[PDB]
C-alpha cells in the first residue's frame, strides 16, 4: 500500500491548517491506527497523535487528529512558526506499517 500526503503546505501565524493522509487501497479507518509524527531541524522526531486521535502528552492543544471522509487528517489551529516542520503519517495494514512521504509545512 501507498500512503500519500500533500508534499507541502504554507500557512500564516494564527491560521488553521489541515493536512491529510490517504490510502492506496481504500478509506482510512480507525483499524489503521493512524499516527502523526513531527520532524524538526536536525532530525528531531516527536510522536504527536496515535490511534487516529490520541494526543501524546506534552503536545500543545492546537493539534488534533480525526478522520475526514476517507482520509486521516491532522489539524493545527492558530499555527505558530514553531510548528514549521515535516509531518509524517503512518498507517497500519495488519502484518506492517507504511509511512507517507511527509508534508513540509512553512509558516510565513
Amino acid at each position: 500500500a501507498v500512503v500519500t500526503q500533500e508534499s507541502a503546505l504554507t500557512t500564516s501565524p494564527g491560521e488553521t491548517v489541515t493536512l491529510t493522509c490517504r490510502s492506496s487501497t481504500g478509506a482510512v479507518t480507525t483499524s489503521n491506527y493512524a499516527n502523526w509524527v513531527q520532524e524538526k531541524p536536525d532530525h528531531l522526531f516527536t510522536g504527536l497523535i496515535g490511534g487516529t486521535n490520541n494526543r501524546a502528552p506534552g503536545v500543545p492543544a492546537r493539534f488534533s487528529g480525526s478522520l475526514i471522509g476517507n482520509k486521516a487528517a491532522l489539524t493545527i489551529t492558530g499555527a505558530q512558526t514553531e510548528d514549521e516542520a515535516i509531518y509524517f503519517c503512518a498507517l497500519w495494514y495488519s502484518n506492517h506499517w507504511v509511512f507517507g512521504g511527509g508534508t513540509k509545512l512553512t509558516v510565513l
Binding site: 509524527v37 528531531l44 496515535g50 515535516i86 503512518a90 509511512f99 511527509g102
Partner: protein, 120 residues
Amino acid sequence: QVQLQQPGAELVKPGASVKLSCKASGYTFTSYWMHWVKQRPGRGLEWIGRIDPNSGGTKYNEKFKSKATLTVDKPSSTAYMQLSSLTSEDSAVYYCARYDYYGSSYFDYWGQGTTVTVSS
C-alpha cells in the same frame, strides 16, 4: 525521563556488517514494542520491523528480511539491529522508536538516530 539512546554514526565498508544499538531508560522496557525506521535523503521513512522485547518475537518488512536482524537484551534493556552485506542503498539514518502497543497506539519517543555511511 523516557530516553532512547543511540550512537551518532557508523562509517563502514561495502559488504561489511554493523550492529546498531538503542538503549532505553526511564520506563519498563518489556511493556512497549520497539520499532526500527530508515530515513534516506530527501525521502521519508521506511519501516524496517518491530520486536516485542518480552518475547523476542519479530516482524519484518518483507523488503528487509534478508538484510536486518532484530534482537534485544532484556537485562541491559537494549534493542539491537544488525545489517548484513551493506551496500550504497544502506547509507541512511536509522531510528529506534517506542510504540505504546497496549496504550494509546502512538510512536511517542524516538532515538536521535544513527547515521550509517558506506564508503570504501
